[PDB]
Write a protein that binds this ligand. Structure first.
Ligand SMILES: O=P(O)(O)O[C@H]1O[C@H](CO)[C@H](O)[C@H](O)[C@H]1O
Ligand SMILES: [Mg+2]
Length: 219
């Protein structure tokens, strides 16, 4: 009965949240900020580029000019873009490709609900572009935890958020799905994502049949 699945990209479709963390940590360290560790990174996962830089600057109460802000965000993006040039279809997380094929087979809409402006490039690297019905443009969207990206993804495929399931690996993204009206299914540790939603240990658990059951049970 759900008519759409709204996929986050980084950390759900492939291991790209890890490279974003590495590049942000590298950027932070260059400007003398050392607090970007894996614990702090849980607050940055799924957050847009500019909002992530601001969260990093805030950690140390540092202020930069509008021109230095743009230079810093660009430097980090340049590093990250270099890091992902070799991303291949072998990097698609287990179960994701089969889920995309089964959702297609059952006429269920597929949308990307990513904050990443590098999303289209990554889907191309992974030969996944053709499995997506729409990509919610991040460029008309407020950063997660705001529900904006998930609301935009659902409507990009002509479905209401209430008729959709959202898949996420981050604290900000889970909250975004929750406020969108869509049903969240997290992937990761219960210590990071919480105990109130349905959570799976790895993406191999994201099957069409599991998604149908979670949906049957929300009722
Ligand atoms: O727009 P990007 O720089 O490609 O991606 C932006 O959003 C993604 C969402 O996973 C990450 O939070 C990344 O650190 C951030 O910079
Ligand atoms: Mg993510």
């Amino acid at each position: 009965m759900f008519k759409a699945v709204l996929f986050d990209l980084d950390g759900v479709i492939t291991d790209t949240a890890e490279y974003h963390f590495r590049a942000w940590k590298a950027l932070a360290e260059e400007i003398g900020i050392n607090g970007v560790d894996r614990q702090f990174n849980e607050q940055l996962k799924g957050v847009s580029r500019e909002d992530s830089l601001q969260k990093i600057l805030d950690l140390a109460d540092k202020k930069v000019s509008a021109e230095e802000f743009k230079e810093l965000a660009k430097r980090k993006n340049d590093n990250y873009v270099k890091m992902i040039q070799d991303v291949s279809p072998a990097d698609v997380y287990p179960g994701i490709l089969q889920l995309l094929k089964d959702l297609r087979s059952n006429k269920i809409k597929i949308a990307l609900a990513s904050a990443s402006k590098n999303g289209p490039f990554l889907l191309e690297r992974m030969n996944l572009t053709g499995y997506f019905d729409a990509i919610a443009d991040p460029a008309v969207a407020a950063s997660k935890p705001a529900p904006d990206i998930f609301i935009a993804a659902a409507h990009a495929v002509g479905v209401a958020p209430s008729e959709s399931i959202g898949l996420e690996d981050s604290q900000a993204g889970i909250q975004a799905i929750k406020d969108s009206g869509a049903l969240p299914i997290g992937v990761g540790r219960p210590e990071d994502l919480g105990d109130d939603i349905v959570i799976v240990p790895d993406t191999s658990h994201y099957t069409l049949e599991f998604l149908k059951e979670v949906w049957l049970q929300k009722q």
